[PDB]
């Protein structure tokens, strides 16, 4: 029972996340006590390889609390997706989804072939972490239903195709990364440029009209509340390293003042 | 001398192996004492990256016993095959081999360009582990003769094309993973389904006809024995973690009965 | 919240079955957390498990969300090593080489915060460690002592002579026999069935029974484990991960070849 | 080149603000090296940092090329552990559980090459280690002793009783109060504001003022750190990395939800 | 702290001497940072250096506070791998097997943020990575591109044939010859002195001179390195860490035994 | 099955040349296993090698399948540290800081299982450790002692004063001189050629010869190693991995720039 997937598909309340960039088992376990709905282990812009991902998923699970792990893969390469699923990640985020075919392919990589999903490309291996090392031979009958797919729309081409992307069966969430979108649209460093705001609004309306959840990365709490008020549901409230630096610098300023 | 390569070519005797899924140096070393003809460090469905492969190869080698290491690479990407070979793996298994072009390419990646292999794609670097850090002077002239290539046939297309794949120069062994093949054929988790069994029978017959050893992954000793009687040669007797779990759970129920 | 291994050791009469973890592997620990054992022992004395390895194996076992209770055997009775294991969240500790009731009492002190029930406690206070949920268990200090269990390994001839007084040491929750080291210290290296070794072991078990303190033992095989169960040992180790791995893989090879 | 923490501890009157590093993270260490603190503490006592973690965290802090001075709290006053910290390039060491002037003097000796100014120095020579730039720092044997700072933690009743004599030990550069352990040791586990604890902490602070030795303290929050600064403490820890991370993220979640 | 390798590559005739780092060792890397080389290459293609190793070796070199410029050879021109190396702080990248001007242009684009100076840039943005001082370098997006340098390896017949156009690609700071790979590719495996190979090499060198683009090369020994310096190559690798280690320890044994 | 270093130390007259491994690198260890040395020292005292690093480097050396014998210098004479090094499969141990014949005997005891041959052995028993081929060596306990060798380091005035009695201690296979630590301890830091230091060294060397015990020494260069061989030292270290790496790479640079 992938509860994050259930809430994305069947809820209307926001789901608050933290980005995990530090690659620290202790930081992941500590933050599994922070009360967030989800936590993202980034492989794309943080140096988390397969063993780091399995270690951090273990550290989160060890807290025995409700936060759902998400893994952002570095790319839509079959072997990389295979590693994250085998490690036990049940919600994956794919960067640079530009076309409906990119999105369909991402979804196929997460699906065991079934009548449910005819053309699936997910590989079978019964001794991996995800199959409790062989102790759930029932694994293969349920897994397809519990794997969530989040696609990142971060380019002009992807925004133009976003309605087709959102209509792809198996796309559970569209995710907006404002800084990459802004750069890609010719507006490096300026996420509130009207071209960028127009593109983000279009992703949000497309999700709403397709009945597909929309997520977004927020750099701070003020922006996160704006995105909530606007209708985004999967809201990242910035990142571990960013909070660590803000908080320790603020404390120092206070003592010195 | 790669003795697994030599016995795959000249022998009729079966060659028994064990799958190493745990990623543990200690388990690899211990199991190097177990009497197996070969041991497989899996990079596809276990989280073994280049340093993990080098550490397990050292751990097996440290035992000073006859077990031949096999490395299954995550995918047919040049850079990955390059890492495996440089680390000193001399018998490589390729997943997802579907066409004779795929098989030819796998072989090309493992060969330095020579008159015997004019289209070899293996990159030259003299200081790597495989060259004893520069101490094996004649490394470039002796390497190609000691590399073995095992191609895994795991799709309907691979099975369709299996006669052409087996005829490919350089292919030392055809490897059947019944679980993957059953998924691919629309019988997820049902390796006993008769279309699965016909597909496996066809790969085996292809090998006998080509004079190419056939390998297979067995989940239990009964199946391993069936395969041996059928003519499979390179037989995996399940996986480290599967034996570890069976034996510890059986011992517990014996004690407590 | 509750160390169920401690509670069962002190309150129950039933056997508690364990497996020794020597391989130092997170995946192996997580896999074995599905094997049904009452406890699993991460060994720091005779396996190369240092503090980060202990924490990573604890996490790996906890991640299975199943009932096995981890036990840590520390390398030696040094304050800094005991601190490392407790801070990492191990709540049941095994101490090697306990030979006198002073040794046993010291081992206990090292596991206790100074408090009314343990005024001589020597455990160092740090609120941000893994054992305190990184600061989130705000009453960690007031509630930790009650959940820490101490197992003393009795494995020498002096220890056997002192075993009734070791058993009566407050805070000793289990007496553990390692027959291999016991046989070696009594002059019978490699011979755990020498009658003098069997006599020593019988004494330790009897001391436990008379004191109402659980006795444990490392069994090298299943026949042994059953003999020990029948004799009244409670905390019974059914050999070790690496031993089962070798035995089962070697057995499978023979079967396939026969 | 110059240990500026030692320099300012000896020569200056200003507070020197620090942060505890308990996460054991290279990236967290490098990031925090950009935060403006005077010092950063890699804890080996109450966090799982062994020798290679200390080296990699030292390297991470150094790679920022900024003023923060690393401090390493050793697990215990054992010669081999002190050696590991010094060889890795830690130039300011903190020693837990210092209770007697002899304990203090021993800690100092472990950090000193035997030399005219330190005839009983016990630091071991090994010219190939990181601290000696692998042999490239040719004046290392002449320059090292003067750049090593020794901080002694006073955190027991006995230590407080001897604090004036500890403070007078040559080579003691700072007396550091851990209020949590000191409170426990005085029978007030969990209550650092009890009057008996306050009196003990004030005695440590007076002892340093009187000896001309800087005094340090661990603060749980900024209001307490400011009270300490006003009282005359100089080496003031502004809580821990993990503490700030948890507080910040939890406060952020409530803001977003409210 | 400007990229001085890019600066010196863009200008003048001076040789720039380097060492290949294959051992994958933080300690070796920091030690070699003291050896006086202009640059040091962390190889990901033919040594087992993954993202965390690259970051750890970059930290280790940085910790020495000395002038050597790190270079990272990526395993392939796959966007995710290039992203990893840039986010880890690598400012000079070497790309293997560049064969066409389109390959070279693509390699360059992967390293640049999209900006007025580079409107076709494809480098992706993440503000919290090590290259951005984890968000503390406020002007990073506007200053990064100017300090990133690109070395393209020419090691195939096809690359040789296109070399003048590769050289003309904006953003190619250096054409690097690997003779071993080139010789293999030209059907002369193991024989870098065959005249077909020397011709090919001479052509790459003439192309760079004519264009004012620095040419680099791997030398296996000092005789070779000198021959290449005299011929006009600027970015000269003086063999590899492991090769010098083996050579020196083997010759020292011979001297002590003779 | 034969510790050839132990046999040659006890029965040979030939020199036994070694190399100090301080880099902590598996690849460097395996490469150096090809360089032709009699012995290779994995240092745990003055390099950051903990138990897993020792096992990794032992594997890496063994993987070469060549004749070099590994030696491990333990950090200290502590039962748990010795257990870790022996259990890992090290068969020759060097102990630092041996000052008295009681020290030396204790060290020997720590390496021996209690057998008829060594009834006072203190080595704790474990049958499934790497040294026991994970339990495949079913007579490991009964046969391990005969292949375990002990090297004691003499590095203080007290040790030199007691060197005749140390050398007479059963089970001491080699007296090892570290000139740098000896010099420091005798009041001559950095001055290994002072007459006091040369006089002490001569006495250690004479004591070994008289007793029929091999004498070892650490040499910083080949000319010193040659002098020591001429004086009658047998177990001769030809400096360290990192020192050769730096000398060789720096020499290469000099030769290319000249």
UniProtKB/TrEMBL annotation, chains A, B:
Organism this protein belongs to: Burkholderia cenocepacia (strain ATCC BAA-245 / DSM 16553 / LMG 16656 / NCTC 13227 / J2315 / CF5610)
Supply the Gene3D superfamilies for this chain.
Answer: Phosphoenolpyruvate-binding domains
- Which keywords does the record carry? Lyase, Metal-binding
Per the record, the similarity remark reads:
Belongs to the HpcH/HpaI aldolase family.
Span-the-membrane segments of this chain are: none
Query: Which InterPro entries does the record associate with it?
Result: Aldolase/citrate-lyase_domain, HpcH-HpaI_aldolase, Pyrv/PenolPyrv_kinase-like_dom, Pyrv_kinase-like_dom_sf
Q: Name one GO cellular component term.
A: cytoplasm
Residue stretches in coiled coil:
none
Any one Gene Ontology molecular-function term assigned to this protein's record: metal ion binding
Q: What is this protein called?
A: HpcH/HpaI aldolase/citrate lyase family protein
Q: Where is the HpcH/HpaI aldolase/citrate lyase domain?
A: 16-244
């Amino acid at each position: 029972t992938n509860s994050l997937k259930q809430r994305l598909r069947d809820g209307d309340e926001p789901l608050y996340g933290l980005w995990l960039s530090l690659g620290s088992d202790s930081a992941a376990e500590a933050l599994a006590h922070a009360g967030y709905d989800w936590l993202c282990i980034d492989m794309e812009h943080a140096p988390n390889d397969s063993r780091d991902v399995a270690s951090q998923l273990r550290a989160i699970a060890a807290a025995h609390l409700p936060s759902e792990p998400v893994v952002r893969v570095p790319a839509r390469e079959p072997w990389l997706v295979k590693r994250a699923l085998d490690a036990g990640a049940r919600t994956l985020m794919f960067p640079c989804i530009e076309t409906p075919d990119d999105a369909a392919h991402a979804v196929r990589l997460t699906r065991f072939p079934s009548p449910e999903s005819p053309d699936g490309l997910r590989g079978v291996a019964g001794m991996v972490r995800a199959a409790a090392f062989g102790m759930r031979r029932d694994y293969l009958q349920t897994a397809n239903a519990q794997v969530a797919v989040i696609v990142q729309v971060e380019s002009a081409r992807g925004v133009d195709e976003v309605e087709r992307i959102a209509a792809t069966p198996g796309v559970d969430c569209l995710f907006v990364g404002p800084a990459d979108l802004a750069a890609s649209l010719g507006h490096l460093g300026d996420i509130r440029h009207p071209d960028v705001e127009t593109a983000m609004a279009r992703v949000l309306a497309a999700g709403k009209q397709a009945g597909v959840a929309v997520g977004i990365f927020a750099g701070d709490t003020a922006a996160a509340r704006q995105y909530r008020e606007a209708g985004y549901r999967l809201i990242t409230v910035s990142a571990d390293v960013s909070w660590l630096l803000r908080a320790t610098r603020q404390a120092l300023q206070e003592v010195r003042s």
